[PDB]
Design a protein around this ligand. Structure first.
Ligand SMILES: C#CCN(Cc1ccc2[nH]c(N)nc(=O)c2c1)c1ccc(C(=O)N[C@H](CCC(=O)O)C(=O)O)cc1
Ligand SMILES: O=c1ccn([C@H]2C[C@H](O)[C@@H](COP(=O)(O)O)O2)c(=O)[nH]1
Ligand SMILES: O=c1ccn([C@H]2C[C@H](O)[C@@H](COP(=O)(O)O)O2)c(=O)[nH]1
Lengths: 292, 292
């Protein structure tokens, strides 16, 4: 796209200029710190769903809703045919990180929970946290309506006071919304990702947050502006270096568009069905492994 | 410089592509959201202390130590003759924001307190919080000491659960550290600043974090790498426009240098005299009016 390309070039930079870092998850990876952020116009309904490799947008949409509901149980993504949180939730893994009395499938006070109940005291993923902690999302929405120029529209998942309790620390830790009014519309979003996995990570989150912006934009009666991905520890797994170059030689197809609704009116009232993506023409999928 | 010059461009870019916006503090501005982050090298003892305008380095130093100590009382900073917090702590401001039962000078759970006592239950800037909350700064130094390639070296002041109790929401909300070991050194730092005042702010913060970075690198035996300033709502106050083209025309003098200590080894044991800044050759100073 020149959008997705800009991303590809980064997939090459981290390769021809990456850094050999011994990885804690125990794996060989190349990495670059704080490279130049990736921008994606969200205009004309365009949705930045990378074409150079089938992205699991089905899990993306499903996981975002899981986030907004403030749910922290992987079992719920399992009940919907999504196993992206099975590992960091395996009874085995919980133990490795000391969470032994924590029941399986309970990811701790991750993303969503912080999004809607920040300060709230976490205690089991099956409890109802209505009224507890601070609801960033609701606030963000409320503000954008009230006074849209606010410079404090911050959605975060990074709670240092609740880290150990988490099955995995907030990877994409927070984002700041901004709305430029014409000379009203243009809801932009710049998020900060501390650790970025270009192969499976970045793409998924690009779409993940592009929707977020679209959803919140939609509900606030705004147009999505652009989306800029800011990354810190950007990295690539060696066991994929080759499975990235063949991709790099691939020509990026134009991004599809996203059509929200049929007057869905709540944000907390979105369903897999209320999201419509048209003209997605990606290349042949590639089984992406990883590490933990 | 081209370091400072890059900054200068950004200042003109805002003037040319800036957006007329109603400022909350009250007075008019021009803002650009998500501009390309400024990088500054700390390589070879260089210190990004802008030269096209005298910078309150002393203000900068005293305030960092103040931060580190986890102090939240402006009065302290006043006993040292700094007045940068006298406003947002004035009796008149506190009430405008509702903290009508807050004794003047009590900024609340801001930067410092969050850095060393995050989870802690703040209450009165004269109380002893020793061992309360999460001591991010301490945990960061430590992880860097043990496992330096940690993708989780985050220091943040943004606590959604405390924002109201604060005299002002964190501006330079957070930063992640990263260390590139050779074939060890390089302690680079990337901070996200939701609201950047290219006028006074940014410059002051480039120094503020440039030092924090050096300082920590110092106690970890590492050498600094570079500094990356990422910014959200980057802007300018009209009442300083004409006041900028004048500066936009000055030729940036090369940055001075920073040599820390005499083996100060803790980050908790620093003082003005431990900071020697060789070769700071800025142009005369420019009186700029804030905006509460
Ligand atoms: C960064 C930061 C923290 N801050 C705090 C802080 C608090 C409220 C604000 N409010 C507004 N409207 N804009 C700001 O940028 C701002 C900054 C100077 C004062 C304060 C901060 C100054 O006066 N700096 C001197 C000039 C005056 C002097 O010599 O004393 C300088 O030259 O640096 C930064 C710089
Ligand atoms: O949305 C996500 C979630 C996880 N990760 C990756 C980043 C790192 O490779 C590892 C997390 O590292 P630490 O939690 O140890 O910091 O998982 C991503 O890239 N994107
Ligand atoms: O280091 C700093 C401290 C904050 N400010 C400014 C930014 C805004 O001018 C104001 C904060 O705007 P609010 O989001 O608080 O309204 O304080 C800076 O630019 N730099």
């Amino acid at each position: 796209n020149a959008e997705e390309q800009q991303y590809l070039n980064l997939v090459q930079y981290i390769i021809n200029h990456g850094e050999d870092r011994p990885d804690r998850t125990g794996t060989g990876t190349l990495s670059v710190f704080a490279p130049s952020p990736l921008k994606f116009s969200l205009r004309n309904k365009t949705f930045p769903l990378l074409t150079t490799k089938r992205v699991f947008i089905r899990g993306v949409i499903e996981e975002l809703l899981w986030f907004i509901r403030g749910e922290t149980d992987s079992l719920k993504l399992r009940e919907k045919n999504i196993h992206i949180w099975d590992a960091n939730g395996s009874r085995e893994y919980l133990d490795s990180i000391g969470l032994t009395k924590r029941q399986e499938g309970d990811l701790g006070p991750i993303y969503g929970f912080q999004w809607r109940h920040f300060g709230a005291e976490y205690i089991d993923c099956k409890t109802n946290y209505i009224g507890q902690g601070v609801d960033q999302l609701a606030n963000i929405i409320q503000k954008i309506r009230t006074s849209p120029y606010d410079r404090r529209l911050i959605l975060s998942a990074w709670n240092p006071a609740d880290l150990e309790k988490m099955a995995l620390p907030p990877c994409h830790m927070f984002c700041q919304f901004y709305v430029h009014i014409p000379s009203r519309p243009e809801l932009s979003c710049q998020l900060y990702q501390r650790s970025c996995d270009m192969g499976l990570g970045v793409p998924f989150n690009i779409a993940s947050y592009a929707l977020l912006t679209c959803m919140i934009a939609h509900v606030c009666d705004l147009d999505p502006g652009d989306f800029i991905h800011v990354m810190g520890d950007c990295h690539i797994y060696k066991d994929h270096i080759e499975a990235l170059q063949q991709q790099l030689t691939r020509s990026p197809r134009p991004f599809p568009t996203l059509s929200l609704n049929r007057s869905i009116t709540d944000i907390e009232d979105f369903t897999l069905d209320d999201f419509n993506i048209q003209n997605y023409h990606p290349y042949e999928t590639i089984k992406m492994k990883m590490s933990i």
